[PDB]
């Protein structure tokens, strides 16, 4: 995946706090209703 914040590919949920698809929360479908509305 790539990073919410450093931009870089090679990113994870272990490498950074999220990846681009939050910031923190990182649940399976909960940013579309929250994080990217
Ligand atoms: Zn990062
Ligand atoms: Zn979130």
């Known amino acids: 995946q790539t990073c919410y914040?450093?931009?870089?590919?090679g990113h994870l949920s272990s490498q950074?706090?999220?990846?681009?698809?939050?910031?923190?929360?990182?649940?399976?479908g909960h940013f579309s209703k929250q994080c990217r509305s």
């Open 5 to 9: 914040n450093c931009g870089k590919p």
């Open 16 to 28: 950074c706090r999220a990846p681009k698809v939050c910031f923190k929360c990182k649940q399976p």
